[PDB]
Design an enzyme around this catalytic site. Structure first.
Site, PDB file in Angstrom:
ATOM      1  N   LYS A   1      62.937   5.515  77.564  1.00 14.47           N
ATOM      2  CA  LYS A   1      64.012   6.301  77.896  1.00 14.47           C
ATOM      3  C   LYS A   1      63.769   7.231  79.171  1.00 14.47           C
ATOM      4  O   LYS A   1      62.421   7.490  79.672  1.00 14.47           O
ATOM      5  CB  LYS A   1      64.535   7.466  76.587  1.00 14.47           C
ATOM      6  CG  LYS A   1      65.037   6.734  75.628  1.00 14.47           C
ATOM      7  CD  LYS A   1      65.982   7.804  74.334  1.00 14.47           C
ATOM      8  CE  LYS A   1      66.874   6.923  73.624  1.00 14.47           C
ATOM      9  NZ  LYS A   1      67.237   7.714  72.503  1.00 14.47           N
TER      10      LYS A   1
ATOM     11  N   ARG B   1      61.543   4.571  66.514  1.00 17.07           N
ATOM     12  CA  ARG B   1      62.267   3.399  66.909  1.00 17.07           C
ATOM     13  C   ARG B   1      61.658   2.971  68.367  1.00 17.07           C
ATOM     14  O   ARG B   1      61.641   3.909  69.343  1.00 17.07           O
ATOM     15  CB  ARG B   1      63.672   3.714  67.017  1.00 17.07           C
ATOM     16  CG  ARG B   1      64.666   2.637  67.517  1.00 17.07           C
ATOM     17  CD  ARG B   1      66.062   2.930  67.325  1.00 17.07           C
ATOM     18  NE  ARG B   1      66.957   1.948  67.901  1.00 17.07           N
ATOM     19  CZ  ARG B   1      67.316   1.897  69.398  1.00 17.07           C
ATOM     20  NH1 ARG B   1      66.811   2.484  70.092  1.00 17.07           N
ATOM     21  NH2 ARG B   1      68.194   0.900  69.632  1.00 17.07           N
TER      22      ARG B   1
END
Lengths: 279, 270
Positions: B214, B248
């Protein structure tokens, strides 16, 4: 935060700094000091400087198990030209990874800034030469037998032996004029410890700041990583990065690694996390 | 240490489990996706997360039929071959319903079952659900404008969602909390959330942390997202040391190594 001083150079240890391992064992077609040997080392040193590495750790120990032996002159022929060339080209700190008083003395003369000694200046003449060199020294504690906790012998007593070791070494250093602010503590991951013992040392690494010295953590590609993961030391990058991240979160001021580009990324992530942490 | 139950299946959340993100968008062919799923199983990944519309900000908006065509064949192929948990990454009730029918074991919903019919479909599915908190506006600390109040909004959100779940027959032990790394937060806000992540165990739900590749990683490092592996591994390590039960990730083989290291360190914390 502590300032580490080596003659005219200064580093503020307000964060984790990376020390890149530059082993100068020649390849099988080269000898120490030859053009290709120095070129290969200088290209690695330049990559370390560009990545933001704070220390370049030069070590002349043979990493070629098939080479029968390495003479002292050969070891000097392998470290001294590389140290000279880096010193003349870059402001980056150079560490000499040795226990030998002769190598310490010669290496500082051509520009080493720091002595990294797994034998903690206990070899003949090493204390005298380090004092004359007037550079900081990383002292490694090499524990002998394990010592279990009386209250729960599943765990180690991590502090009794190193406390005795350190008080004796600081006293010895003081006796030749090496002040305590020149010392760095490596608690000594590896060197025969079980997996449990090594990971307890990591789990409790922040408690070692109690001795008042900056900490050097060296876990990179060690058996504590590759035996836990049941891989070859060459497959051990990711595990090594996790150990480096845990050490950086626990405030280890110097993290000594093979994979310096990747470790520069993880100390940046750790520093960003620490900057947003409460107290 | 909690036990997660999905009908016939059970997982004990006494350590960090890895959820691997399975790429089924053109962001590829079906056999490549199955081979990736098999590599995940062999690496020890606990959950395979399948999504047909990306939840990254700015991602394309995908039609319903396209979302179905992307996820239903791979879910069926994995379910036929492996007992590993499959998660369906969707906010759409119709996708949730059809995915569970062919083998999905868990619903991962960035909108926390707020879309039309999602709550009732999740209840009928009788599978666990990861609810993400998506804060729309930062809230600074009343006494220190330089830092965030991390808890006021999520506390209000979770009490409302837990009560809504209970009203359709979803018990709390079915719920997983994702605190929502990313989604327009500043770098400082994202790293404060990570720095304080262990405080989120106070809500009594297993935590899911998803930081992989991210912007909090690649914009911190000033690199392309393709270069964000090492930074993502550092984030995963920090989250695992703070006890996040589900992590995750895209880089699942490397993350299995980091959770092993974290578990060994946590085991030796006297």
């Amino acid at each position: 935060a502590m300032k580490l001083i080596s003659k005219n150079k200064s580093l503020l240890l307000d964060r984790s700094h990376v020390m890149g391992i530059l082993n100068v064992t020649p390849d099988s077609f080269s000898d120490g000091g030859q053009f290709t040997h120095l070129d290969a080392a200088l290209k690695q040193a330049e990559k370390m400087v560009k990545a933001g590495v704070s220390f370049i750790d030069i070590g002349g120990e043979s990493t070629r198990p098939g080479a029968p032996e390495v003479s002292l002159q050969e070891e000097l022929d392998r470290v001294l030209p590389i140290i000279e060339a880096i010193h003349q080209r870059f402001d980056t700190w150079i560490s000499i990874d040795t226990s030998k008083a002769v190598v310490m003395e010669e290496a500082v003369k051509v520009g080493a800034d720091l002595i990294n000694d797994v034998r903690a200046l206990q070899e003949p003449n090493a204390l005298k030469v380090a004092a004359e060199a007037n550079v900081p020294v990383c002292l490694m504690h090499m524990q002998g037998q394990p010592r279990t906790m009386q209250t729960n012998p599943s765990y180690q007593d991590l502090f009794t032996d190193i406390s005795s070791f350190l008080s004796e070494r600081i006293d010895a250093c003081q006796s030749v004029g090496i002040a305590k602010d020149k010392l760095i503590l490596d608690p000594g991951f590896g060197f025969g410890k079980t997996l449990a013992h090594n990971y307890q040392l990591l789990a409790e690494l922040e408690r070692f700041h109690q001795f008042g010295l900056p900490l050097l953590a060296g876990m990179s590609r060690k058996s504590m990583v590759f035996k836990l993961l049941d891989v070859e030391p060459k497959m051990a990058l990711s595990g090594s990065l996790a150990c480096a991240t845990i050490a950086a979160m626990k405030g280890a001021q110097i993290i000594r690694v093979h994979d310096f580009e990747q470790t520069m990324d993880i100390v940046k992530v750790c520093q960003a996390t620490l900057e947003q942490s409460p107290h």
